[PDB]
Symmetry: D3
Subunit: 88 residues, 6 copies
């Protein structure tokens, strides 16, 4: 059933730069579950877990071709909890 | 804007027994925000804060005429955060 | 990879009484993941999530033939996170 | 330096009944730090850690001569964090 | 009544630079409550909520004329919880 | 007894640069407990408390001769909780 999650919206130079793979790899390292996608208004990252370490490291380790201009966060409800972290 | 909340659904003998006032008073004592209502399928309590102490004390201090048969919890998203605890 | 979990050790009259199914059903209602077993020194419940609501309700809704004499908790590390709640 | 703590005020039949030792033993089992005292308006328990499991078990395992009528909680600031749990 | 809060003390080039408005805007984006002021030893930010995302973004998005040299955090107790985020 | 902790593994130019003292001083400022060591594969920091603010500030305030290339985190269990923060 449902659980509280977090959606992060990351905007900047975040496409064509290895950003979705970067997010994926960071989520793997952090043992996070959810997904990442590029929906045309930046990159959306949905997580089951608290996003703080992820956010710290998103910024600090941003790929060299990428550039993060802003990150927004909001809560949402998972309909079913994720068991993996996937690129969608 | 939005925040993660918790909805509790309390079923049993929970109407005509001072249950909504009891919930209100417990929320006041605990400095909780949200609301309580009876919507015909028990009592729904919506909280901004984590419900655990509230739940402990709901059970332990249940009014004498009342009887709690079950409590369910689920997350939801507040559209605007509550600044009081109110009976609705 | 690994995550912080909680092991609960529940002792009393907790076998032959529907206790493992009771735990399972409570974990389902609470959307918890991990497992339950009877290993000869009571019932061990391992959870991914914080156990507090589970504990409240374990006590309050204890099956009628069962009797809980004590519950102990300790942290441990999951080797892989659970995706279900199962009876083992 | 300072940290956020919780003070619990437990009222009822809570003196002459083994209540301070009971609290101590529960805190030991739960690996909690802080202190307990009887200051003439019930028993005050100060904890470094979140009090929820403690509270659950305070109620469920209340000594037979004791009787808990109410428990109140409030936050406070530790001037120095406790390294033990002690009866004061 | 009272709740646990966090006070952040931000020092550097943090006056005459749009820092209080920057903090305000960040708190709005994050749905945080409390206040900000310049009391002559940097900027003090008092929050109801956990400060971690705020801190991440304080640093990453520091206005161009500003410069953050240090940030300290300590807990404190709110006398009444804030319902807005305001510049004081 | 045991508690959930966090181990951080910090790699880069992190030896001969005042890194262990830097970590120590940051832990003191943050009122953290645990330890730091250099075990030949970077710097390991073990903490009792949640590491997020520590991590934010590790990166932002990295000493000038140092360079942080990566930070990994994993949970572990303390055998006895630390009462100080020490360089080992
Ligand atoms: Cl992308
Ligand atoms: Cl009602
Ligand atoms: Cl069993
Ligand atoms: Cl006493
Ligand atoms: Cl200012
Ligand atoms: Cl080193």
């Amino acid at each position: 059933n449902t659980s509280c999650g977090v959606q992060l919206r990351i905007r900047g130079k975040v496409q064509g730069v290895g950003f979705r793979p970067f997010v994926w790899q960071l989520a793997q390292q952090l043992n996070l579950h959810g997904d990442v996608c590029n929906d045309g208004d930046g990159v959306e990252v949905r997580l089951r877990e608290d996003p703080e370490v992820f956010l710290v490291q998103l910024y600090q380790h941003c790929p060299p071709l990428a550039r993060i201009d802003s990150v927004e966060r909001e809560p949402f409800i998972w309909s079913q909890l994720p068991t993996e972290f996937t690129i969608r």
